[PDB]
Symmetry: D2
Subunit: 235 residues, 4 copies
């Protein structure tokens, strides 16, 4: 049970995986979670039903996070349904791994546009909708790959390393109005394990609880920071 | 609040300030706190009575965290009282700020011995006692000065930067036994404020709750990490 | 001064500023420099004349480093002319500083496409043309803003932090063929003071000579590194 | 053929390994190198003779870099012989690897005092002797282990991570007098594990030495407080 002064959170790309776990974790901690899905609603709706059947507060919302007007419109609808938006998690993202010499600029842009510009739009709009209340916390879901790089991931590492640095700039622009911006860098989340000191993959739950901490009031003096969740894979 | 599988914690140098706060916070979330002091029990005893009067579990203990035998014997004593030790916070440290051309070697060793060797002994003995249980979390209280350095603090920055790197090595050695080692780097904790994006000093409680998270089950995939708690002063 | 096994280098956006200085420095060390410019040829031509009359080897080449086909064909031309290309410096980049709430997606993309995708293309083509000879060095001109962020520069910090992470992934992909990839992070440079420890802006030649070292044989065990050239402004 | 405004350099623990290559490299670029050694004069004196026979300027000096009074006396002897001291390389260092539960505080201190306290003394005395000239550059030889830690190296990682942070503090203190302080973090240097190194080989001592030379040289005049990785890609 983590303490939250805000009441609601938008999680982009939250139908499955880490984003889904973020939704369950934050819902179970008493926040109303907005589950963003791009295309099919069946998985998102099921996650929503699961949480409500547990007595939690959840809703789904359709928009492409890579789309400026779509994302903008959605935030407005959430401010119009709940009165505001206190928390944002930029989780949406894709991979298209290729050795760089086989990588077209279209493949580079596919990952940049979906992973970095999406988080720009989200952080920008959060700044607009939380500046009024002088309260908000935003978490950007980056990756160990943005910190250290990886074979075959020149485009993914660019998107996540640009995310990490973008977040710092947003932290300066939100700081006087008490809007915090931070990043999480998960390692390998469920041989790969041979290089992990904890000798196991991380659980999606373990990422989700690190996000919860950075959104929560307990991290109220943490901004512009990158929280590693990698089991020791990178120190 | 935060969930803890373990039951007790030892905090070095915990009579006041950040150390006292860590003791308060961890006591309020159900842990038995051992409040370490090395010379005068007064303030530490007031802390104990305060926490007990609020309904928490607390105890004082006298040893010099810079003495190997003192630290070792105190941890043995706590293991005898409680059956073991789940959590350790290496918080004890001193300053002796001087421009380096005025700094004697004894002024360098003063800070190293009180600040870095203390945390080596604590980290070492935590490994011994937590290894049996195959469970533990250890937080080293470092400082922004150990990340970026500072005019007049060649000795303190060496002690805290050494603390950060040491803790990474202990994280490797504790990992298979599920014993985690992390560092917190506080910034300016209650002209200087102008350089802080959040435009205020940090509260001691805001450091303590970051320490709480790193000890908690919620950070279960985080080891060898340094967590910045500095209001954006360093990114 | 410094020793180079390679014979030539392409420098993007080399008409003025740091990029011009890079050409001057590298030309004076015996390399044939290829001075890239986008529109105005006069300044680029004037630089070639200067370098040529001083007794060095220099050529200009027009193309938009943000344009995939332009960039690909230019490197093709240089390989046609010189037989190869041993060195690449991705220096081209633009700024469009705005507070994020004033920033259109179009403004974010303007900087991403011109700063990040341009460097991706150059790095990718370097991999292709350098791999046969199993030799080369590539330097990416990033920025302190990519390391610590800056208010009003969510887009520039994104592109340069993305550049930094990118470069590391290229270092993995080039490593086995001895193709090195490193970044330089300049501070405040005169052509581009209280908080700067050296108490002055950096000269463009001071950036150029750090780039030269990373291209040189002297840095032959250095790859995936980011070299800070900021007068102590960031440590 | 890097450019140096200064004329001489002291390299602690320079009789072999990386420190010896630093002396070779820097002597071949025209500096008078002072080769520090602790006990064995034979290898240092062979090195000195090797360099002099190639036309370079070299000298040996015996002292313990971990002894404040020795280190202090040695630098006044160099100032006495040469008129000043432009450059300093804190290379002296040892290892005593043990799992932490088997390591006594005295094994911790042995590494702290030999690796970290020595670099403090050297940096401090550099500040003193370089101040009046308002010119100077100092390189601290740290390690990848100080950046990321290592199993069995809680003492070594502490000394070298402390050296890296401490060097940044010296950079602030020397900056207005234009005395630069920088660190190098070599990876695995010759004199399996090679699988994790992207460049697929151990580094040559010469490759560390030339990185050191660059940070000493005029080419790095706007670089201070920096840590230069020299690890073949092992840590990025």
């Amino acid at each position: 049970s983590m303490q939250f002064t805000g009441k609601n959170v938008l999680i982009t790309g939250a139908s499955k995986g880490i984003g889904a776990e973020i939704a369950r974790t934050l819902a179970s901690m008493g926040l109303k979670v907005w589950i963003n899905y791009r295309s099919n609603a069946e998985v998102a709706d099921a996650l929503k039903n699961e949480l409500e059947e547990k007595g939690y507060k959840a809703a789904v919302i359709k928009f492409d996070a890579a789309s400026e007007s779509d994302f903008v419109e959605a935030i407005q609808a959430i401010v119009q349904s709940d009165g505001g938006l206190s928390y944002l998690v930029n989780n949406a993202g894709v991979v298209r791994d290729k050795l760089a010499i086989k990588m077209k600029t279209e493949d580079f842009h596919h990952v940049i546009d979906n992973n970095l510009t999406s988080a720009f739009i989200g952080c920008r709009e959060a700044l607009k909708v939380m500046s009024k209340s002088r309260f908000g916390s935003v978490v950007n879901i980056a990756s160990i790959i943005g910190e250290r790089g990886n074979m075959g991931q020149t485009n993914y590492s660019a998107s996540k390393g640009g995310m990490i640095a973008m977040s710092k700039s947003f932290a300066y622009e939100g700081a006087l109005r008490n809007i915090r911006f931070n990043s999480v860098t998960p390692g390998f989340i469920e041989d790969y394990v041979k290089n992990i000191p904890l000798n196991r993959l991380g659980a999606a739950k373990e990422v989700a609880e690190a996000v919860a901490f950075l959104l929560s009031d307990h991290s109220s003096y943490i901004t512009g920071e990158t929280l590693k969740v990698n089991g020791g894979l990178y120190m």
